[PDB]
Symmetry: D2
Subunit: 224 residues, 4 copies
């Protein structure tokens, strides 16, 4: 069933990359999804999974062949990454992923975007943003752990595009998504790439992914 939903997403959206479903990955999701898990643990496993996810996402960047010579004096043919990048987090949940990106990409520039749906209208509105000046020339790792209706990420993408970022240079790094959110992102910006660790079955009236994980943001920052 999951397999079916998984395969369907996979054949329908060539631009999505699902992390390999290893037993460890599932053990981690198990801990974080459990409502019984304590904050310290949740944080620990969340950070652990984020590192893997980020490492996976970094493979979507472009690279060049590069040849070097070993200390044994023989050549080795490698493949360097030479592009300019930055991370852009969706406050506040996406900020939880910043440490992971910074752990592997030392001193990478981090932009931040704060968006909030209108109480009545539901239109996500941009409340605040601080981004690198030359973001237009960069590849961007857009971070947001949950992608439910996809309203916030679509708005985040809209502003990036307005700023001049090329759609095909956007890599959306996500932990958990709902098929519905995935479909919206691709209907609106077919050129972006998305990397996620899991696809659930549905979304509820309150807009939570199910079986899901609850509110990632409060669980992670402990404001629940």
């Amino acid at each position: 069933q999951e397999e079916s939903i998984l395969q369907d997403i996979i054949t329908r959206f060539p631009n999505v990359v699902l992390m390999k479903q290893t037993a460890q990955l599932r053990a981690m999701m198990t801990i974080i999804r459990d409502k019984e898990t304590p904050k310290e643990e949740f944080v620990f496993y969340a950070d652990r999974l984020i590192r893997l996810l980020i490492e996976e996402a970094l493979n979507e960047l472009p690279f060049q062949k590069k040849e070097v010579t070993t200390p044994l004096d023989v050549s080795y043919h490698g493949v360097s990454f030479y592009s300019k990048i930055c991370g852009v987090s969706i406050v506040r949940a996406g900020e939880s992923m910043e440490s992971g990106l910074r752990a592997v990409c030392r001193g990478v520039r981090i932009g931040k975007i704060l968006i909030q749906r209108d109480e009545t209208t539901a239109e996500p509105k941009l409340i605040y943003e601080k981004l690198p000046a030359d973001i237009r020339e960069r590849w961007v790792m857009l971070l947001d752990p949950m992608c439910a209706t996809a309203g916030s990420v679509c708005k985040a993408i809209e502003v990036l595009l307005r700023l001049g970022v090329k759609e095909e240079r956007i890599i959306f790094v996500n932990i958990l998504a709902a098929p519905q959110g995935i479909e919206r992102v691709f209907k609106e910006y077919p050129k972006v790439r998305m990397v996620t660790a899991a696809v659930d079955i549905c979304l509820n009236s309150r807009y939570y992914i199910v079986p899901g994980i609850g509110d990632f943001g409060d669980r992670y920052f402990g404001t629940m």
Copy 2:
């Protein structure tokens, strides 16, 4: 002149704790202050200094005596810290300090406060905030690397107090301050405690501390 400034602050405000001015601390400050410092380096040293700063501030919490028995079956008389705490960052600069606090206090709850200075005047306005629910019952480590006019931190304190936080349970953790910001926080909230790594000379017309460090947030996050 610094010494004199340092001492005057120390004699005038019993509630401020100045980190011991060791040569290593100075070395870190020079790297951080240096315009010429590359971003990866800035982050590395800023992170190093912040941890020391957080370790210092934690000493302001309350503790009880505790006695234990060593594996050698002999008693050791120590202490233990038993308070409920949380960190509250002032977005975005203060956010640079959360990782530091999370490194030593596993899974500590983190609240965030976004304050904006108004365009007409410049009175600070509360733009957004997400705090722990029982924050009123906790000691609060308030994070903001720079304290120039103290307009932002004073605004943050006002909201915390309005929510029920006891003024004397607020510990303001700061890296660099200006005598004037210091005087203001204490004239308004004489009971809070403040821990800083340095006190500079003055503020310019632009309200930057001098000699200072430039824009902390832009430098730490790379959004020049």
Copy 3:
């Protein structure tokens, strides 16, 4: 060439697990093998790679099915890893992988074995060992970055077996290996499991893997 090789090994040795040869993996490998890379970079990249290698190895462990209830008050079928394990470093090169293991397995027990080849005779001899008292009851993550002739690892496994560890519970974690090395380990202990990041062409006239990386321990600890 390389593809042939990988294919043979994979085919002849069902117990070897080669990590997915991603572009990022290759990129890290290129920086670590490059004789011109500075000690800091070597260390940073080796650590990063070792972290991915351990995450991969962890999948070799036994796991139980586990169902949990999410905050949405709905069931999620996950898995749980229940075995007692420990890491066993082959001094000194294997020590470099300890931090990686401790990063993902907090407080995991770490055993150490120092094996040295006789200066004249070349026979590998056990010089020093310090292992957990109940190692026989645990799954062993045996750490050693390089596997050239396999002389060292074979001796290490021999001592573990004399202590009662089951051959089938040894997961040999390696960064780089030579075909001869892999062949020997499997001839002598067909039951262990081996996880590695790369397999080189051959050994030097002086028993060095080629193209290789050079002396990993000297490069990692900076004693070259």
Copy 4:
């Protein structure tokens, strides 16, 4: 009591630097000394403490004086550390401190010295060593958490001196020490510097530090 002892040592041994006995330091010491403390907790706190100890120790190195210009385009009077250094751990216990050193000094060179007492004879023999080739030209951060009779440390120092290391350039970094150990070190090598976090009252019949901590190496690596 402890104050008496401390005063004597401080008075008689001008080269020992006791770290500031803060409530935090004490609470950390109370957890690591507790026989009831679980391994994960033991490791987390020792690591935290080692970090502060290492920062303290770094202040023993020589530094210049350096002026930089701030972003405010004003100059600042700082300092810089210009010495070639390296860390040398006394296997195994001393190894627990390497992470801390590498945390603050990226890619610092690490030498290793395994000294063991003859099982009949009781004396210290050098079993294995792997040091940087130019150690003779650097400042040595000698790492060993405990100092009871000082037999091991005195042997480690003898070996470094035979390699050409200057006595006055060794900074012995230690967590816990007994007065007799301190006395011995200085009887034999009056010019080294020693930085420590606690001075206990005495050794017991089995030459165990009391009240002490039990066997550090065993509790840290879990080979209890």
